[PDB]
Amino acid sequence: EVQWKVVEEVYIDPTQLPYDHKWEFPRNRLSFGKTLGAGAFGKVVEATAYGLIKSDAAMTVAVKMLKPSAHLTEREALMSELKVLSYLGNHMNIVNLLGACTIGGPTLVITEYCCYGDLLNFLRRKRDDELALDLEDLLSFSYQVAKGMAFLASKNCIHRDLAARNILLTHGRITKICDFGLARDIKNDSNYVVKGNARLPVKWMAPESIFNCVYTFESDVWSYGIFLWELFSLGSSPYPGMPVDSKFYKMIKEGFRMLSPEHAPAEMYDIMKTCWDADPLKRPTFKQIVQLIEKQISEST
Ligand SMILES: Cn1cc(-c2ccc(CNc3cc(-c4cnc5cc(OCCCN6CCCC6)ccn45)ncn3)cc2)cn1
């Protein structure tokens, strides 16, 4: 199933969205490289596309595709993902669609290549790129993820898996929102727990998504709060030493929340606390979050 939801300004069926043939690119002008990320059914591979944006210029791109082991329903879901990406349009703070190969073979989704890879591994390596990481970087990543999230919300799009492992970093320390989806081995990632029917990122999920399967723009805002916690603790897994079980669900239902990370400015922990409000209607919108971090950046400067 396609994970990203698009709501009517009622859910829009992604198969009903259009595929603009302006994105069509010939497969024989792609030269594949190393695998950047891989799951059981899909992968993201680095590639050199020849004459994609500029007429004759070669450029590094990332290709989303499936492995030969993928069934028909997955190939359809990749086409549906390409239509959502095409519908979303362009924004600085998302991993943008550059082209696609849908004729004469399997679907290949061509997007921007972000040289630093995922933010979670970037933050983890910066514990204990040659350059050091400071508070000015973390505040900028918070600001850019929020702009990217408010862009998605403006397109009536609920991401449903916002976490540091789905945020890429590129030249200039620009954070772009992504979703590895089938390009990650969730069968071997302890952040996705088995619900008996599927593997979910429970520690990033709002109470109403765990208890009622309700994913709203507000639930996404909860996940952003968990992301801020991850980011300001330099890649620490949420709720340390607390396994996802009956005890975890009880405290979450009761109103238990994580403690402020060490590197978090007080105004930033208040942002987390408001994203974690039990009542979704009392949580800030991404548009309100952007204005808050804009104020925090000017106070710093
Ligand atoms: C709702 N909503 C969906 C999206 C969305 C969904 C799907 C997509 C598809 N596109 C991609 C692209 C990339 C990608 C691009 N560049 C890299 C570079 C990478 O690594 C390099 C660094 C290695 N390290 C260097 C030292 C050793 C390791 C890894 C991954 N990517 N990953 C995944 N999907 C796009 C957007 C956005 N919003």
From Swiss-Prot:
PTM-bearing positions, type Phosphoserine:
190, 260
Regarding how it is modified after translation, the entry says: Ubiquitinated by SOCS6. KIT is rapidly ubiquitinated after autophosphorylation induced by KITLG/SCF binding, leading to internalization and degradation.
Substituting residue 6 to D results in: In GIST; somatic mutation
Which superkingdom, per the lineage? Eukaryota
Q: Where is the Protein kinase domain?
A: 30-301
Consequence when changing residue 173 to W: In a colorectal adenocarcinoma sample; somatic mutation
Q: What induces it?
A: Up-regulated by cis-retinoic acid in neuroblastoma cell lines.
| Amino-acid positions noted as binding ATP in the UniProt annotation, renumbered to this chain | 37-44, 64, 112-118, 165
Q: What is the effect of changing residue 198 to P?
A: In a germ cell tumor of the testis; somatic mutation
Phenotype upon changing residue 165 to G = In PBT; with sensorineural deafness
Q: Which residues carry this modification: Phosphotyrosine?
A: 11, 192, 269
Query: Changing residue 192 to F: what effect?
Result: No decrease in activity. Leads to autophosphorylation at Tyr-269
| Effect ascribed to mutating residue 189 to G | In mast cell disease; systemic
Active-site residues per Swiss-Prot or TrEMBL entry: 161 (proton acceptor)
Cytoplasmic side of membrane: 1-301
| Binding locations of Mg(2+) | 166, 179
Also noted in the record is: Numerous proteins are phosphorylated in response to KIT signaling, but it is not evident to determine which are directly phosphorylated by KIT under in vivo conditions.
Q: Which family does it belong to?
A: Belongs to the protein kinase superfamily. Tyr protein kinase family. CSF-1/PDGF receptor subfamily.
- Summarize subunit and interaction data from the UniProt record for this chain: Monomer in the absence of bound KITLG/SCF. Homodimer in the presence of bound KITLG/SCF, forming a heterotetramer with two KITLG/SCF molecules. Interacts (via phosphorylated tyrosine residues) with the adapter proteins GRB2 and GRB7 (via SH2 domain), and SH2B2/APS. Interacts (via C-terminus) with MPDZ (via the tenth PDZ domain). Interacts (via phosphorylated tyrosine residues) with PIK3R1 and PIK3 catalytic subunit. Interacts (via phosphorylated tyrosine) with CRK (isoform Crk-II), FYN, SHC1 and MATK/CHK (via SH2 domain). Interacts with LYN and FES/FPS.
Associated clinical condition:
Piebald trait: Autosomal dominant genetic developmental abnormality of pigmentation characterized by congenital patches of white skin and hair that lack melanocytes.
Question: What function is annotated for this protein?
Answer: Tyrosine-protein kinase that acts as a cell-surface receptor for the cytokine KITLG/SCF and plays an essential role in the regulation of cell survival and proliferation, hematopoiesis, stem cell maintenance, gametogenesis, mast cell development, migration and function, and in melanogenesis. In response to KITLG/SCF binding, KIT can activate several signaling pathways. Phosphorylates PIK3R1, PLCG1, SH2B2/APS and CBL. Activates the AKT1 signaling pathway by phosphorylation of PIK3R1, the regulatory subunit of phosphatidylinositol 3-kinase.
Kindly provide the name given to this protein in its UniProt entry. Answer: Mast/stem cell growth factor receptor Kit
